[PDB]
Amino acid sequence: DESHVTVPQIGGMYEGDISRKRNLVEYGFRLPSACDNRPLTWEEFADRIGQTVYLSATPGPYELSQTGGEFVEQVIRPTGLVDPKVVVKPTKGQIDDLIGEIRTRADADQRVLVTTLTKKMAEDLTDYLLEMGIRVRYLHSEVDTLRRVELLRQLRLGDYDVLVGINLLREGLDLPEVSLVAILDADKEGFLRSSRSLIQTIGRAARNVSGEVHMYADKITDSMREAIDETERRRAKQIAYNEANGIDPQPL
DNA sequence: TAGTCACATCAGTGATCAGTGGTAACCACTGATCACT
């Protein structure tokens, strides 16, 4: 499940653990048996697995290469969930528009998630945007469990309206009342900011009854536009399916 | 540098009971002085 971030997680975790295991065994901390005591490498994983089934919100490049591109699509939600609308704007000239949109939308008392690249201008935005009169919360690189479980509690208590985070946002931060999400200058190359994070934020906005993404780029890359195109076509398919399945949801 | 990434094991740390450390008659005596005839 969530293979798009599970298989890359397996690879990266194996790489990091084998690096630290070399740093241990070579520098006298553990035996090479501890190096053998490791998460499964992908070669031996393939050598050991049988009928392998993958499942994720997005088609992983490794899975697509392994399967040749032929997959099965079931991302359509009979429950009535659609992908978010997309607005693309330049990086500059956006703060006034954001303030106007949050003033117009705050009557619903929802939450808006924003992202940046590194810490300095991110925190500059945070203290400025708490200065001009909006309650804001931020995420850092060393977020512990309590400091955002309390964030979840106080957002279900409706104590603020906006969250900002760079990397501490893809792990279990589900919220039933997040409508608009802003992506700021993520077009630049990064080992931790390629297309999967943008599609993950798109899906996070999608899980709402009415999502929205505001995407700011100095330059346009093929990955983001292909992701937007596939998201839009999937949303069109979901809307077409839901137009026939007009029955209201009946949870059971 | 990303959320977890395997696996218990030492240190001297309060409060308090628990269970090692600290516990005048009798009138029996005999003598002195003495009340008595």
Curated annotation (Swiss-Prot):
It comes from the Bacteria. Disulfide bonds: none annotated. Residues 94-247 form the Helicase C-terminal domain. Forms a heterotetramer with UvrA during the search for lesions. Interacts with UvrC in an incision complex. The UvrABC repair system catalyzes the recognition and processing of DNA lesions. A damage recognition complex composed of 2 UvrA and 2 UvrB subunits scans DNA for abnormalities. Upon binding of the UvrA(2)B(2) complex to a putative damaged site, the DNA wraps around one UvrB monomer. DNA wrap is dependent on ATP binding by UvrB and probably causes local melting of the DNA helix, facilitating insertion of UvrB beta-hairpin between the DNA strands. Then UvrB probes one DNA strand for the presence of a lesion. Belongs to the UvrB family. This is UvrABC system protein B. It comes from Mycobacterium tuberculosis (strain ATCC 25618 / H37Rv). The gene is uvrB. The chain holds residues 360 to 611 of 719 of the full protein.
